[PDB]
Design an enzyme around this catalytic site. Structure first.
Site, PDB file in Angstrom:
ATOM      1  N   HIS A  44      65.102  68.079  37.494  1.00 42.14           N
ATOM      2  CA  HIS A  44      64.421  68.611  38.670  1.00 42.14           C
ATOM      3  C   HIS A  44      63.905  67.446  39.503  1.00 42.14           C
ATOM      4  O   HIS A  44      62.999  67.605  40.321  1.00 42.14           O
ATOM      5  CB  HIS A  44      63.242  69.519  38.275  1.00 42.14           C
ATOM      6  N   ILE A 168      48.468  63.561  27.700  1.00 42.82           N
ATOM      7  CA  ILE A 168      48.505  64.939  28.178  1.00 42.82           C
ATOM      8  C   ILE A 168      49.591  65.699  27.408  1.00 42.82           C
ATOM      9  O   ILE A 168      50.696  65.184  27.208  1.00 42.82           O
ATOM     10  CB  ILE A 168      48.789  64.966  29.712  1.00 42.82           C
ATOM     11  N   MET A 170      51.940  69.063  27.292  1.00 42.98           N
ATOM     12  CA  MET A 170      52.413  70.066  28.236  1.00 42.98           C
ATOM     13  C   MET A 170      53.823  70.593  28.006  1.00 42.98           C
ATOM     14  O   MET A 170      54.735  69.838  27.667  1.00 42.98           O
ATOM     15  CB  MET A 170      52.349  69.469  29.650  1.00 42.98           C
ATOM     16  N   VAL A 171      53.990  71.898  28.202  1.00 43.24           N
ATOM     17  CA  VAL A 171      55.300  72.524  28.099  1.00 43.24           C
ATOM     18  C   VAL A 171      55.674  72.880  29.539  1.00 43.24           C
ATOM     19  O   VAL A 171      54.804  73.180  30.353  1.00 43.24           O
ATOM     20  CB  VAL A 171      55.277  73.820  27.250  1.00 43.24           C
ATOM     21  N   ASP A 172      56.962  72.797  29.847  1.00 37.22           N
ATOM     22  CA  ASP A 172      57.514  73.111  31.167  1.00 37.22           C
ATOM     23  C   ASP A 172      58.882  73.647  30.751  1.00 37.22           C
ATOM     24  O   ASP A 172      59.858  72.895  30.663  1.00 37.22           O
ATOM     25  CB  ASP A 172      57.648  71.824  32.002  1.00 37.22           C
ATOM     26  N   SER A 174      62.061  76.606  30.996  1.00 33.00           N
ATOM     27  CA  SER A 174      62.847  77.623  31.689  1.00 33.00           C
ATOM     28  C   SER A 174      62.953  78.785  30.706  1.00 33.00           C
ATOM     29  O   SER A 174      62.931  78.567  29.502  1.00 33.00           O
ATOM     30  CB  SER A 174      64.252  77.079  31.984  1.00 33.00           C
ATOM     31  N   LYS A 225      63.481  87.809  23.843  1.00 33.93           N
ATOM     32  CA  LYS A 225      62.135  87.316  24.123  1.00 33.93           C
ATOM     33  C   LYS A 225      62.049  86.587  25.466  1.00 33.93           C
ATOM     34  O   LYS A 225      61.192  86.912  26.292  1.00 33.93           O
ATOM     35  CB  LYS A 225      61.652  86.404  22.990  1.00 33.93           C
ATOM     36  N   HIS A 305      54.796  64.747  25.702  1.00 32.91           N
ATOM     37  CA  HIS A 305      54.407  63.365  25.475  1.00 32.91           C
ATOM     38  C   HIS A 305      55.476  62.364  25.914  1.00 32.91           C
ATOM     39  O   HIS A 305      55.186  61.182  26.105  1.00 32.91           O
ATOM     40  CB  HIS A 305      54.017  63.151  24.006  1.00 32.91           C
TER      41      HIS A 305
END
Lengths: 332, 333
Positions: A44, A168, A170-172, A174, A225, A305
């Site tokens: 992205h 930090i 974090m999950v990002d 799709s 899911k 990470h």
């Protein structure tokens, strides 16, 4: 192709300006593209720039357009992106959710008529940098078939959750096992997917990036899911912003534009002491990274990470951009 | 074993009373266990009751304990469950989040020192019933290994998202492809898993429920995605509740208790008009149901949309409980 942060940003700015993009606007947008890339997000990031310019040249995006607030209800606000640049507007909308959180403990910004925000993680990250918990997601044009179907009627609707931990966390992700951007990443690297990413010509599951990109029968994360979560995320984004859903964008728009996004920020410091916060977070992180490795030659890593490690690697050895992608940009 | 609603509830009540649960709390708790079962949820309905009783006897649960507000910060509130009954307290806390959203547009209750809430979808459903968007989750004891590892260090931390659509659209998903409750359901029904359930002992992926229950090598839903989401959910529940994380619970507790949960309710009717809400939501759902099928005879079903038929069928035909489970319950007496 090895390039410096300056080099990448220059290329982005030049192309933007040649397309009639404002001066400071082009520089702002170019900054984000280069930053996302240097942080380790190629999918992205730089790889998505060409497609971005295309949609801009097609008019999908309105260069000088700016976000406009529609309804103000305390911690909650509904905004109209007015088909402005996706990453620049999102950055601003998440900053507003943060402002709201600073006063209400929590802030939610519902944006309609927006454009693709590129990297959702950019906004979760900026929230976490400020000490807040960041949550955001967006909908898109039909690019995923709901579980049980072979026709695309659902979106990839990436969900981001970022924590003000150190580093930090974090999950990002799709809702598709692999976003289309990651399918490309693998193809550009000349490899196959590590796990099933979709179905072939009305057949079984396949690990070939190209096949999935063609028929668009991309596999939902967790089957029913991921498919299910995508739908509810679309509903929330559509309702709160009173904007366009995946169906509306896919049936009333020529391409992927006029989408809806949700930006949330949750204050932490008033609910838990700073020292204790860092202490409990450390306990969770160490409990994960000290686990029994499934492969001794592969250290366990916490979600997001790599955005810290990859950044350090890039600002040291320079940024590697896929030759075909770079050539694509140069051709612009 | 075909039993009526009152008959099933009667069994739950009897056991609760014999374990020191007061009449009023026994009836309410028994009510929830029966309702969840009647609604079609067995994994976290009747089939989980025995496990609940055992934890109650070990002292994990404190029957007469009730939720207590620690801090009130407008739309957000931090509460202490004080080791109270999980499902009963979770219902009250989602109800609180709802009240909060009614005036603040959004509500968030962070709950610490709580017990297993049984079915997360119950709370998502309450919100949707009242016209609110409901989102909630909880952490658990280490029962799943993080991506890249083989030792259990993270929880199944189920995530629930419910929409006030007609019918209610809701997801209630374990971070593991299959929750331990669903594995049991497939084992009792005698059948294999539709997809990979986990890594068989010192092996690769497998679809054998029983084997997965052994080594507890349950496969995370979406691989690195389910693993990562599980961890961030654990961090939020821990921080906002200033409570115990999966690590704390596993390390400093004899079993799964003293857990942390999050209940969120978001107001809808003030941001969008009724007719517009019904219309846009209908367009979304129809766009899915009318999707060209992979199997012409297999309809495309929206998440949570199966509860309508499951409930209607149980209310007129009765509730079917597993014979072995129904026996293990009576044996408790």
């Amino acid at each position: 192709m090895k390039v410096t942060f300056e080099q990448l940003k220059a290329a982005f700015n030049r192309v933007l300006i040649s397309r009639g993009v404002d001066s400071e606007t082009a520089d702002a947008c170019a900054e984000m593209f280069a930053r996302t890339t240097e942080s380790g997000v190629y999918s992205h990031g730089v790889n998505r720039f060409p497609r971005f310019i295309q949609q801009l040249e097609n008019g999908d995006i309105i260069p000088d357009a700016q976000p406009k607030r529609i309804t103000s209800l305390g911690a909650i606000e509904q905004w109209d992106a007015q088909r402005s640049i996706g990453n620049l507007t999102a950055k601003k909308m998440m900053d507003r959710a943060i402002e709201l959180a600073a006063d209400h403990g929590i802030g939610l910004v519902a944006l309609r008529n927006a454009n693709h925000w590129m990297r959702g993680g950019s906004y979760g990250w900026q929230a976490a940098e400020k000490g807040y918990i960041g949550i955001c997601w967006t909908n898109s044009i039909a690019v995923m078939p709901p579980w049980g179907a072979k026709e695309c009627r659902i979106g990839t609707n990436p969900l981001i959750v970022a924590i003000p931990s150190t580093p930090i966390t974090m999950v990002d992700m799709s809702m598709s096992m692999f976003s289309y951007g990651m399918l490309e990443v693998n193809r550009l690297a000349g490899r196959q997917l590590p796990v099933d990413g979709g179905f072939d010509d009305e057949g079984n599951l396949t690990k070939e990036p190209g096949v999935i990109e063609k028929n668009r029968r991309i596999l939902p994360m967790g089957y029913w899911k991921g498919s299910g979560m995508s739908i509810v995320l679309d509903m929330i984004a559509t309702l709160l912003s009173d904007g366009a859903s995946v169906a509306e964008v896919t049936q009333d728009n020529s391409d992927e534009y006029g989408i809806s996004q949700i930006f949330i920020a949750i204050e932490v410091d008033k609910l838990i002491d700073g020292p204790t916060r860092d202490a409990k977070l450390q306990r969770i992180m160490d409990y994960v990274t000290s686990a029994e490795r499934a492969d001794e030659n592969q250290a366990i890593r916490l979600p997001g990470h790599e955005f810290t490690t990859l950044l350090a690697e890039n600002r040291r050895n320079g940024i590697t951009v896929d030759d075909s992608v770079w050539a694509k940009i140069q051709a612009l």
